[PDB]
Each structure stands twice: as C-alpha cells, then as structure tokens.
Amino acid sequence: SHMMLAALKEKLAALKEKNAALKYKLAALKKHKATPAELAALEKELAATEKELAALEWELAALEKKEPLTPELAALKEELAALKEETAALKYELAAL
C-alpha cells in the first residue's frame, strides 16, 4: 500500500469528523439566538473546510499522476465529492439562522 493513500484516507476521515462537529455546532445555535460574531465564527469554520476540501482534490490528483492504477482511486474521488456536497448543505442551513 502507498503512504499517499493512508495520508489521504486520514484527511478524508478528519474532514468527515469536522463536518459532524459543524452539525452539532448548528444544533446548539438553533437554541441560543446567537450573535453575529458567533454566526461569523461558524461561517469562517465553513470556509476553512471548503479550502481543505479544495486542496485535497489536488492531493488526490497528485496521486493519480504518479499511480493511476492504484485501487481506491474511484472511491476517494467519490468520498471527496460527498464531503463537498455535505459541507455546502451546512452552508445553506447556517444561512437560515
């Protein structure tokens, strides 16, 4: 196995746990009406996830250039596309607070 895969798999798992922590941050803010600073804080955390997902596409892209026949290449591209759609769904939910 490649260390390019394991480092990519760990980052895909950590960003899935960062999205789940963002879900719980939304739930708490549906209770307390929240200040603009707290609303701007969850938004800045949302933009940080979009940046990490965008650089991960380049990370996965460098792996395809040096090893296009590596197994899990299709599942890693689909897992990143799901994380991007999951992050965007948290953006629309926040915009209604």
Residue numbers in the entry: -2 to 94
Paper text:
First, we garner sequence-to-structure relationships from antiparallel 3HBs in the Protein Data Bank. This gives core-packing rules, including layers of hydrogen-bonded polar residues, which are combined with surface-charge patterning to design complementary sequences for acidic (A), basic (B), and neutral (N) helices. Next, AlphaFold2 models for both designs are used to seed computational designs of single-chain proteins where the helices are connected by loop building. Synthetic genes for these express in E. coli to yield soluble, monomeric, and thermally stable proteins.
Manual assignment of the subset of 169 structures revealed a strong natural bias: 121 had the anticlockwise topology, and 48 had the clockwise arrangement. Notably, in single-chain proteins, the predominant anticlockwise topology has right-handed helical connectivity consistent with the left-handed supercoiling of CCs. By DeGrado and co-workers, helical wheels suggests an alternative design for the assembly with the opposite (anticlockwise) cyclic order of the three helices, which can be achieved by switching the polarity e = Lys and g = Glu giving an alternative neutral peptide (N′). All confirmed the three-helix bundles with up-down-up topologies for the B-Ā-N/N′ helices. All had consolidated hydrophobic cores with knobs-into-holes packing between the core Leu residues confirmed by Socket2.
